[PDB]
Amino acid sequence: MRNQELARIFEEIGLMSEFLGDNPFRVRAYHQAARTLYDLDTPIEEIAEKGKEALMELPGVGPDLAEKILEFLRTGKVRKHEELSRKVPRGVLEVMEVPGVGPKTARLLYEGLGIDSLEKLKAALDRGDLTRLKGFGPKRAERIREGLALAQAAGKRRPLGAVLSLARSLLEAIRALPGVERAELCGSARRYKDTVGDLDFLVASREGERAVEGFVRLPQVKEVYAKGKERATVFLKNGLQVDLRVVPPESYGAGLQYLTGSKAHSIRLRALAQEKGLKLSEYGVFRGEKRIAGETEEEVYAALGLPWIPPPLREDQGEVEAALEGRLPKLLELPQVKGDLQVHSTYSDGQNTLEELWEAAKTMGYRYLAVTDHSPAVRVAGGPSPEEALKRVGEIRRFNETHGPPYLLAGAEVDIHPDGTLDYPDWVLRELDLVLVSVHSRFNLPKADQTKRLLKALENPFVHVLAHPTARLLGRRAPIEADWEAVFQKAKEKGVAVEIDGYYDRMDLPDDLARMAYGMGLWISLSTDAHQTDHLRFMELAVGTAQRAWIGPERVLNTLDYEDLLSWLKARRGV
Ligand SMILES: Nc1nc2c(ncn2[C@H]2C[C@H](O)[C@@H](COP(=O)(O)OP(=O)(O)OP(=O)(O)O)O2)c(=O)[nH]1
Ligand SMILES: [Ca+2]
Ligand SMILES: [Ca+2]
Ligand SMILES: [Ca+2]
Ligand SMILES: [Ca+2]
Ligand SMILES: [Cl-]
Ligand SMILES: [Zn+2]
Ligand SMILES: [Zn+2]
Numbered sequence: 001m002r003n004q005e006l007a008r009i010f011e012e013i014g015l016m017s018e019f020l021g022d023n024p025f026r027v028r029a030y031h032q033a034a035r036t037l038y039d040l041d042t043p044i045e046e047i048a049e050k051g052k053e054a055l056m057e058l059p060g061v062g063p064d065l066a067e068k069i070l071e072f073l074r075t076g077k078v079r080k081h082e083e084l085s086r087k088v089p090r091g092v093l094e095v096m097e098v099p100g101v102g103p104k105t106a107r108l109l110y111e112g113l114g115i116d117s118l119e120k121l122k123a124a125l126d127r128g129d130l131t132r133l134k135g136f137g138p139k140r141a142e143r144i145r146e147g148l149a150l151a152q153a154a155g156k157r158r159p160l161g162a163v164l165s166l167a168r169s170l171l172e173a174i175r176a177l178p179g180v181e182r183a184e185l186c187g188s189a190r191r192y193k194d195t196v197g198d199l200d201f202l203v204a205s206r207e208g209e210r211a212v213e214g215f216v217r218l219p220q221v222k223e224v225y226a227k228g229k230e231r232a233t234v235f236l237k238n239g240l241q242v243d244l245r246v247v248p249p250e251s252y253g254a255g256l257q258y259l260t261g262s263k264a265h266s267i268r269l270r271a272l273a274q275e276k277g278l279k280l281s282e283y284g285v286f287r288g289e290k291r292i293a294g295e296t297e298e299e300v301y302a303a304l305g306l307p308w309i310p311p312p313l314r315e316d317q318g319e320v321e322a323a324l325e326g327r328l329p330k331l332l333e334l335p336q337v338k339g340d341l342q343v344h345s346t347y348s349d350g351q352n353t354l355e356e357l358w359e360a361a362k363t364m365g366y367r368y369l370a371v372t373d374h375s376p377a378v379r380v381a382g383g384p385s386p387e388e389a390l391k392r393v394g395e396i397r398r399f400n401e402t403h404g405p406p407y408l409l410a411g412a413e414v415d416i417h418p419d420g421t422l423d424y425p426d427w428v429l430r431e432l433d434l435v436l437v438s439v440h441s442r443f444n445l446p447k448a449d450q451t452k453r454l455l456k457a458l459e460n461p462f463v464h465v466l467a468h469p470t471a472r473l474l475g476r477r478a479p480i481e482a483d484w485e486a487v488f489q490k491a492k493e494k495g496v497a498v499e500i501d502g503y504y505d506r507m508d509l510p511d512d513l514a515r516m517a518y519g520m521g522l523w524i525s526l527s528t529d530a531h532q533t534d535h536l537r538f539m540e541l542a543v544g545t546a547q548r549a550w551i552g553p554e555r556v557l558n559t560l561d562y563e564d565l566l567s568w569l570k571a572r573r574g575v
Contacts, residue, residue, distance in 0.1 A: 001044070002044060003038070003043065004037070006072055007035075007037035009072065010031075010033045013080055013084060014027050014030030015093065015096055016081075016085070016088045017030060018104065019088055019106055020084065020107075033061055033065050036058050038226065039228040039229050040058070041230070044073070048069055048073050055069055055070070091117035092116050094117070095109060095110075098144055098147040099143055099144070099223050100140050101121075101147070105135075109124075113129065118151060121148060122148055125141065125144060125145055146223075147223070149239070150235050150239070159475075160189060160192065160193060160194055160196055160504070160507075161503075161505075161538055162504050162505070163240060164189060165537075167185050170220055170240070171185050173218050173219075174201055174203060174215060174218075177211060177218075178214070180203050180205050181204045181206075182203070182204040182249070182252055183201060183204070184201065184202050186259035187243075187259060187260065187261065188261070191262065191548070192311070192312045192544025192545060192548055193548070194474075194545065195474065197241075198242065199242045200243045200245070200259050201245070202252070202259045204248070204249040205249070206248060206249060212229070212232050212246060215232060221234050222234075230245065231243070247282060250294050251283045252295060253293070253295050253298070254294040254300050257297055260314060262315050265316050265319070267316070268320045269304060269320075272324075273303075278292070278303065280300070284300075305324075306323040310328075312331075312544055313328070313331075330552040331552055332547065332551050332559070334539070336553050337526060337556075338366060338368065338558055338565075339366040339367055339369050339558055340361070340370065340526070340528050340536060340539055341372075341434065341499070341525045341527045341557060341558060342413065342465075342499065342525075342529050342530075343357060343369055343370060343371055343372065343530040343536075344372065345357060345371050345373055347371070347392050348373035348374045348384065349373075349374060350373070350531045352533060357369055357371060358399070362406055366406045367561055367562050368565065369407075369409070371396060371408050371410065372413045372467075373389075373411075373412055374412070374413050374415070375389075375413065375415045375422075377417070377440065377441070378440045386427070390427075390431055393410040393432065396408050407562050410431075410432055410433045410434070411432055411434030412428070412436065413438060415437075415438065416453060416454070416457045419453065420454070422463075426460070426462060429462035429463075430462055432462075433569060434569060435463050436465045436466075436499070437460075437463050437465070437466060438468055439454075439480060440471070443471060444480075445481075446481075447482060450480055450481055451482045451487060454482055455487065455490050458490045458496055463494070464496060464525075465499050466487070466499060467501065468499055468509075468529070469482075469508065469509055470513070471508070472508050472510075473506065474504075474505045474506070476505070484516065488516065492522045494573070494574045495523075495573020497522065497525040498523075498524060499525045500524060500526050500527070501542070502526065502527065502528050502545065503527075503538055504538055506529060507541065507545065509545075511545050511549050514548075514549035514551065515549035518551045518555065522555070523557060525557045526539065526543065526546065526556065526558045
């Protein structure tokens, strides 16, 4: 549908018209036309095909607006919008849309102060320039500052794990609204994409307009950006940008599919529907006018002749073909994970004692946890020395002797030197239960030198896992450049697993490289890189990444029980 695109065009025309001082009657009309298009559920094109008079049946649409709708549908543009855009720069439009600014203020700011961008606006805010204008006091100034921050965040993405728990807190409040029967966090978050834009929630309600009203008045809500009969966009006090859509309970499953996407996956499903005489919309699966499915997501897939497809697969990257042939991949599931294979302690830079790690693992129902403290070069420190590392192995063994399961694996995260040698000697490595190796320095070696360094590390016969291989930090450091085919092939041949480190700003291996590694036949190790017990919750992110990468429980170290894991670690591995 082009409804939302057209709603935006009319809204912008309204904003620009007011900036330019057009008739307030015309300004208000464009905003009413925008609301009508925003609220309209049926495709605008379907009413336009019925003619100009039918378009005029819509609330707010007169002869002028009807011709513009037809113009948009026939040409893809609206000349008036193009005309006003010539008079109103992109930066000034951005300024006027900041909550608390608006078009007439933006005009004064443009003419009088020279503000034609968010940049100048922020400069003016920060210096107190705006305080010398009428109608500007602390309440409005604060609204504008915050509005600017929300504007500047709108294109950007955050790590999934930075926002998932916050999104779930909002989900609890949405579910608790009287009138809401079911709700779910959808969009790219439900697909476990490692960075997310806005957050999208679907609600089932028989009273959708009233559900929207309850939603926008939740204690968590700071600013309402858009609101209508069945949808809203808000910003929370905590800064999260959130879209809500409401559907009737009979449509909930179709709404879940719609709001989860991806867009590419939904395109595939809509074609499959029409090819068998059905229509898939947000509201259901229909044969002619008859709704034949919609209440549950599995029912919707079934009506299209498909098994239910897990959200992390919904990227149009082979899952539709696999579903059509009744051969969806087996996927790793969170209950199959028997432990976390990279956690840190007070022996190095973790906050927790062995007792505290053990207690947390026991709560989680794990069989084991690998305590993998850093070698000295990781910490940019003097220790722990090789002698201390071995003393620690004995202490972890005594801890197991006195505690029992979940068993602690005595491990280390061993730095790879620039030349590919390792930061502990083999007499330490041979005694560790679990040897991880990783890059923590010289991130910008030429690709061929970084590759040689990693290959040399993988030659050491005591290594078990290549930890967080790219070393990326979301928002801070790009992945290292290396020939991952060469690295992964050597790891496979040597029997070294690659890690999916689900720590929220690592997410490393990323899904795409994990998909490559698993497809090449490697073993996989999941971890959270925990430095406090609250980080252990990130295992779900590592599992979601595995699902996106089509990874099953086969060749995942964490699905082995303790005895089988120790056997794997001690075995002659590789070719
Ligand atoms: N990208 C996109 N998605 C659409 C469109 N129409 C419907 N959808 C559905 C499928 C999307 O997964 C879902 C949510 O839209 P969003 O734009 O919020 O995208 P999504 O959450 O998938 O990714 P994001 O992390 O927000 O970039 O809505 C469209 O025109 N574009
Ligand atoms: Ca009308
Ligand atoms: Ca409720
Ligand atoms: Ca989204
Ligand atoms: Ca959205
Ligand atoms: Cl469902
Ligand atoms: Zn650390
Ligand atoms: Zn590390």
